[PDB]
Design a protein around this ligand. Structure first.
Ligand SMILES: Nc1ncc2c(n1)-c1ccccc1[C@H](c1ccccc1)C2
Length: 275
């Protein structure tokens, strides 16, 4: 692949049919840009494009490829960021996906401190739905957090970074990702659908605090100490005891006692209808 990538006609888009635009996100994952895609027939679509950065290595290429390939296998769902196309031939790899014009869910919630209680349970249900789908495709996310949910022009929640190939590293918004990780994942390094369920619990807390910061000011060592003590975040103001018991059920120390995403979806669907 350092000389040429394998061909896949079902997904290939001609480079003359894609016009790259402004940045949407940089990282050591490469970079993502806004782009305009012509006929994914003469239809113009705003899309997001992920590509390597100019200092990427051969291993970064093969990680980008394997993410594209995982998105092919996983298939389409309304509440995930979907693969639309790719330029793999005669030039840098471009992985072309759905664009979310309203940012990540954290940003979306914070700018709107406007959402009804129904809207909030609805965000939770859309995210559980995306997760139920991914889990059914054997995909374990490993960093489910509001930062990794993107929101579209029409307010659809879409999990991002699920196809992806250091406890002290902070995100762009200086928060520590270990604050979303299940204890089995953090301590014993066991990653399952049920450790993603614990992360969903933290994500529910983010939702009902309108994009609050878990454990503000707590460094990695102290968080270990809290999880060891069976500490659990306080119920946020404006959050029914039932939604809090759902968070607390996601935070069960024993994974098989956490609900599943399928149970989460059934409960949230019921909760939305009554809210
Ligand atoms: N505003 C915006 N819309 C869509 C995406 C991103 N940002 C974005 C921004 C930064 C990183 C990732 C992404 C997303 C992504 C998800 C799954 C695979 C490839 C790209 C796609």
């Amino acid at each position: 692949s350092e000389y040429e990538l394998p061909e896949d006609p079902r997904w290939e888009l001609p480079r003359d049919r894609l016009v790259l635009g402004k940045p949407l996100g940089e990282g050591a994952f490469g970079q993502v840009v806004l782009a305009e895609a012509i006929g994914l027939p003469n239809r113009v679509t705003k899309v997001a494009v992920k590509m390597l950065k100019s200092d990427a290595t051969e291993k970064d290429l093969s990680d980008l490829i394997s993410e594209m390939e995982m998105m092919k296998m996983i298939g389409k769902h309304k509440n995930i960021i979907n693969l639309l196309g790719a330029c793999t031939q005669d030039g840098p790899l471009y992985v072309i996906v759905e664009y979310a014009s309203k940012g990540n869910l954290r940003e979306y919630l914070q700018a709107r401190r406007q959402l009804s209680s129904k809207d909030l349970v609805s965000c939770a249900y859309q995210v559980a739905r995306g997760m139920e789908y991914l889990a059914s495709k054997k995909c374990i996310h490993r960093d489910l957090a509001a930062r990794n949910v993107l929101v579209t022009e029409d307010n659809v929640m879409k999990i991002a970074d699920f196809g992806l190939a250091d406890y002290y590293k902070k995100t762009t918004n200086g928060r520590l990702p270990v604050k979303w990780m299940a204890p089995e994942a953090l301590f014993d390094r066991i990653y399952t659908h049920q450790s993603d369920v614990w992360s969903f619990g933290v994500l529910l807390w983010e939702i009902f605090t309108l994009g609050g910061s878990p454990y503000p000011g707590v460094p990695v060592e102290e968080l270990f100490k809290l999880l060891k003590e069976g500490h659990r975040m306080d119920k946020p103001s404006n959050c029914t005891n039932e939604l809090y018991m759902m968070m607390r059920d996601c935070w069960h120390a024993v994974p098989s006692q956490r609900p599943t995403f399928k149970q989460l979806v059934e409960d949230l669907d019921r909760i939305v209808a009554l809210t």
